[PDB]
Structure formats: structure tokens, C-alpha cells
Amino acid sequence: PHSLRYFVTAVSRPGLGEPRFIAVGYVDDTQFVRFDSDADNPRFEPRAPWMEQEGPEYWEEQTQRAKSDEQWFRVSLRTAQRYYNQSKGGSHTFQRMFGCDVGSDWRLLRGYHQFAYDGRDYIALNEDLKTWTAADTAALITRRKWEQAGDAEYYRAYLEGECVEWLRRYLELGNETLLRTDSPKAHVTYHPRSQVDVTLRCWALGFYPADITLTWQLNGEDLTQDMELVETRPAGDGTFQKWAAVVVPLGKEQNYTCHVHHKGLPEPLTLRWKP
């Protein structure tokens, strides 16, 4: 499967200027477009090399939709702050995530249209693409309004049409890189934490896509109860890094094995320490 996603952040700055409006577009784990309100000239910009092929008519239409959405969030921020009885001075954040997922056939798998206010769930379009789930009392008011107005039909028409159509097109433009997988380059490092125990760290480096499974499994433990797992992090070259660590008694390190699952690996990696 493949995914097209837009991450929209609107932050009001009372007394400092208009709300900052930022929209970032991702195809799978690769970012291809950006709109930032604080740029000297705010317009949609390519953040992937394969997007520099797009003609002005693409960029002008995208920028206009971004500028249109900016007014939407400027109103919606004001509408929210007044409903919640919040202080006018307070800065507040509206977040929106929308996009589509396509299956093996490259036909739509799921459509997303979700909102968060001040970092909490507000309203989200359900998987049916026809009904809404409200997080709080305020969202229940948004839901009744959007039900009568028929907003779900407006968003579903895009998710079912332009979103999937442009996902397949983006996959065509960046095909030689987007469809590639980079299997993780994995190794085990041995650091003797104490005089009684040692920390074993399993590394997975330079892998794309971002999804990965790292487990240390002792004697066949499916996973480990006391294991430090860091968040998957970007290397900055389009590949990602992750590591998993366990603290084990000295002399029993060879019982522990690290297992790596990735889209690049048809078979899982099994890693052991060897000094």
C-alpha cells in the first residue's frame, strides 16, 4: 500500500500577527510539498526533487487552495476560542490531517479527514466517509452543522477522486525512488554497563520505509519486558534509524537475539553478539 497525507498546523499569535499556517505533504514517508505562512513569499514549494517537474498551473492551484484554507483556519480559530470562553490573548493551535491510502491495486483503501484543537482530538471523519466522530461537546455542534451542510460528501469526493488520482501520479513522478525499499543495515553493539551486567544495543540504520520491528526476544520471548526502544528517527537523507537495547547478565549475552522486520527484508534478520 501507499499513502498521501497533508499535515496542517494553524497557530494563532494574538498581538504578534496573523495565525501561522503550515501545510506539509507526504507521500508514504517522503515529504514532497510545503506551504509555510512565514516565508517571504508564502506559496506551495516542492520538497522532493521529482516534484520540480510540475508546471505553474499545479503550483498556482495548490497555493490558492492553501491560501483558501488559511482563511478557513483563521475563522475556525476565532470560532473555537469564543465557544470555549478562552482568553483573547491566548495562542491556540488547530491541526488537520487528511489524505488517502491505496491498496495493492492502487485503489483507495481508507480516507482520512481529522482535526485536533489545542492538541486534543476534536472531530474526525469516520472510515465510512459519511459520518463524524465528535471528541467533546463543541465537536458535537460542529458535527450537527457538518451533517446538515453535507460536508462529508464534499470531502469524500476529493478523497475518492483527486487524492487517489494524484497519489498514483506522484508515484509515477517519483517512481524510481518512492517505490524503492532500503533494507536496514543492522548490527549488535556490546557495552558493559556494570561489573555484573552488559547493555546490548541492536541498531537498524539507513532503512526506508519508516515502519520497522525491533525485538530482542530471549529464549523465544516474543519481546522483552525490560528493553529500551527509541523512537524511529530520520537520518536526513530519506532513510531512518532505530535501536533496541537490553541489559543482560554477563556471560549470557549469546542467548539474546535481535530480530528485524522491514519491507525490504523478505526474511527477518536474526542478530547475535560475537566478540
Binding site: 501545510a23 487552495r65 478557513w72 483556519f73 475556525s76 470560532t79 488537520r96 487524492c163
Partner: peptide
């Protein structure tokens, strides 16, 4: 991209 239609309230 798709812009919003109805406002939250």
C-alpha cells in the same frame, strides 16, 4: 490539496 468548506461552528 482540499480546502475546508463549512467552518467548525
Amino acid at each position: 490539496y482540499q480546502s475546508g468548506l463549512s467552518i467548525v461552528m
